[PDB]
Design brief:
heterodimer, A: mainly beta, B: alpha/beta, Glutaredoxin, 5-stranded mixed beta sheet, 4 helices, globular, binds potassium ion, oxidoreductase/isomerase, PDI family member, thioredoxin fold
Amino acid sequence: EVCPAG
Amino acid sequence: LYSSSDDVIELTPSNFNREVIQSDSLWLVEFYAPWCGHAQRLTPEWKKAATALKDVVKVGAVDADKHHSLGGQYGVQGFPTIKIFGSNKNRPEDYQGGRTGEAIVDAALSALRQLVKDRLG
Ligand SMILES: [K+]
Ligand SMILES: [K+]
């Protein structure tokens, strides 16, 4: 449900 | 993802304290990155919520990829992250409900009921 931040 | 043609308020670090922190309004703020598939999916529902909530609840979005500082300030470790800013603008809670327009609006109204009932007491 989410894209990890960099 | 958003533009002047919608009711989503674009929130940069160059207006955040002003638009959000120093505001008596209930605020919903989406922290996103435009390359993130889960954030893209949410875009239409977010616009629908902002429009439904026009003049009732303020609805914002922060590109927390382009502005990672602000993203970091609120511990955003993923996109999209949705924060709700109630009475106390320094304890914004995280929304983990559905991502449909209706789910967002339902959460928005619940939080709003609380802000107003806080005002009353
Ligand atoms: K806009
Ligand atoms: K979005």
